[PDB]
């Protein structure tokens, strides 16, 4: 698939928990690299960008790129604290995706949620149906305290393009578990 993907990380205070090894935040950070590489390896022209949804206010950390070093440099020193703003994040991500240079690229969001969603369900469904209308696919990696997101994904989904990957606390590594999910890398040949 030829697509531009905005990867949204949760850097809220909820992510300072050691119930995922070594913390939720750091668990997520390793998973981002895997998702990145999946996209970059899918098509030579695929690009990824990086946003936060926590610390009170979603931020674009990296515009669309194939250089993972830009993600790592932008995350260095990043605050992990404050509230998550899920709906604001997926709206800002859609605005960012409009600025993609290569507009032949399909549009996708991959978002991590490790915190309570601030939107209520009626709001979540409006968000989802608006994405679907906008031809924006979305995958959500849900961790921590684990239904509303299943309804969201069902409302956004078109042609089996959207996924909810829900991973409880465990001894195993989040990146490995997500790699073993529908949105993981798979194999080559």
From Swiss-Prot:
Transmembrane segments: none annotated. The keyword Nucleus applies. It comes from the Eukaryota. The keyword Nucleus applies. GO terms for cellular component: cytosol; nucleus; proteasome regulatory particle, base subcomplex; proteasome regulatory particle, lid subcomplex. GO terms for biological process: mitotic recombination-dependent replication fork processing; proteasome-mediated ubiquitin-dependent protein catabolic process; stalled replication fork localization to nuclear periphery. GO terms for molecular function: K48-linked polyubiquitin modification-dependent protein binding. It is found in: Nucleus. Its main location: nucleus. Residues 4-181 form the VWFA domain. Keywords: Nucleus, Proteasome, Ubl conjugation pathway. Belongs to the proteasome subunit S5A family. The 26S proteasome is composed of a core protease, known as the 20S proteasome, capped at one or both ends by the 19S regulatory complex (RC). The RC is composed of at least 18 different subunits in two subcomplexes, the base and the lid, which form the portions proximal and distal to the 20S proteolytic core, respectively. Interacts with uch2. Protects ubiquitin chains against dissambly by deubiquitinating enzymes thereby promoting protein degradation. This is 26S proteasome regulatory subunit rpn10. It comes from Schizosaccharomyces pombe (strain 972 / ATCC 24843). The chain holds residues 2 to 193 of 243 of the full protein.
């Amino acid at each position: 698939v030829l697509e531009a993907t905005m990867i949204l990380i949760d850097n809220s205070e909820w992510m300072i928990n050691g119930d995922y090894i070594p913390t939720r935040f750091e668990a997520q950070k390793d998973t981002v690299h895997m998702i990145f590489n999946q996209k970059i390896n899918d098509n030579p022209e695929n690009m990824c960008g990086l946003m936060t949804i926590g610390d009170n206010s979603p931020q674009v950390l990296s515009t669309l790129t194939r250089d993972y070093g830009k993600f790592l440099s932008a995350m260095h020193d990043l605050p992990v604290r404050g509230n998550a703003k899920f709906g604001d994040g997926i709206q800002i991500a859609q605005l960012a995706l409009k600025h993609r240079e290569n507009k032949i690229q399909r549009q996708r969001i991959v978002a991590f949620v490790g915190s309570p969603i601030v939107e209520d369900e009626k709001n979540l469904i409006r968000l989802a149906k608006r994405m679907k209308k906008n031809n924006v696919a979305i995958d959500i990696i849900h961790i921590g305290e684990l239904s509303a997101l299943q309804h969201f994904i069902d409302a956004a989904n078109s042609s089996d393009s959207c996924h909810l990957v829900s991973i409880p606390p465990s001894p195993q590594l989040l990146s490995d578990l997500v790699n073993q999910s529908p949105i993981g890398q798979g194999v080559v040949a």
